Amino acid sequence: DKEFQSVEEEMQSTVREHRDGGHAGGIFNRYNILKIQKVCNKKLWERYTHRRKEVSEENHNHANERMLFHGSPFVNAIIHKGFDERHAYIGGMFGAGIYFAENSSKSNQYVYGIGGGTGCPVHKDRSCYICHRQLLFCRVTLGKSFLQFSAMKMAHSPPGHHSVTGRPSVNGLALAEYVIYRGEQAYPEYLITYQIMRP
Numbered sequence: 001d002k003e004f005q006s007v008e009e010e011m012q013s014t015v016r017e018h019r020d021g022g023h024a025g026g027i028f029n030r031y032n033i034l035k036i037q038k039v040c041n042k043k044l045w046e047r048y049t050h051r052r053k054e055v056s057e058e059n060h061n062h063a064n065e066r067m068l069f070h071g072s073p074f075v076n077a078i079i080h081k082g083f084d085e086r087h088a089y090i091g092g093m094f095g096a097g098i099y100f101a102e103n104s105s106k107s108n109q110y111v112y113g114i115g116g117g118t119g120c121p122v123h124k125d126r127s128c129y130i131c132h133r134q135l136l137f138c139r140v141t142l143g144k145s146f147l148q149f150s151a152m153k154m155a156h157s158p159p160g161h162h163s164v165t166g167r168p169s170v171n172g173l174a175l176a177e178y179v180i181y182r183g184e185q186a187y188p189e190y191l192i193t194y195q196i197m198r199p
């Protein structure tokens with residue numbers, strides 16, 4: 001399939017050399033994609049498209065839809081129940097929102113928890129090349145996105161906006177990140193099962 005080839009391409013081409021030297025996500029340059037499953041949750045799709053239309057009508061008929069990565073130990077809970085802002089932490093860089101990356105390697109750092117947690121459950125390795133990892137390639141409605149460089153502890157989107165775009169800066173972020181404050185503003189379209197590969 002050319003659809004799954006595009007997802008595989010997006011996943012491999014957006015890998016970057018991280019500042020922590022592979023402490024959180026692991027030491028790799030490439031992945032071994034094992035499976036790409038299309039998520040068909042009609043209840044989550046109706047929630048997404050209805051909010052997408054709302055945002056579109058509030059942003060000059062433009063949803064500002066982007067395909068972004070999301071890493072989390074609760075990926076299986078998200079494909080069934082959806083994204084939930086009620087579980088979001090106020091302590092986050094851009095506050096109590098749901099965070100997404102345009103770089104697959106950035107989202108990979110969150111697959112086993114914040115900062116890679118303790119790593120894989122069986123070997124307790126953040127750089128495990130054996131254990132199968134799971135990422136989400138989500139359809140995210142950004143709408144009128146608020147451009148921010150430094151920390152901004154938000155509870156909701158800034159007034160008149162629908163999301164926060166974290167842009168890279170010298171003292172701040174190394175890579176971009178996108179924050180929504182409503183669970184229905186994202187749809188977990190693809191479930192990617194993969195492994196990080198030894199360089």
Ligand SMILES: Cc1nc2c(O)cccc2c(=O)[nH]1
Pocket residue numbers: 069070071072099100101106107108110177178
């Ligand atoms: C839990 C989580 N956090 C992220 C982040 O803070 C920034 C960018 C991406 C992510 C992500 O994919 N998952």
Ligand SMILES: [Zn+2]
Pocket residue numbers: 120121122123124125128129130131
């Ligand atoms: Zn392992």
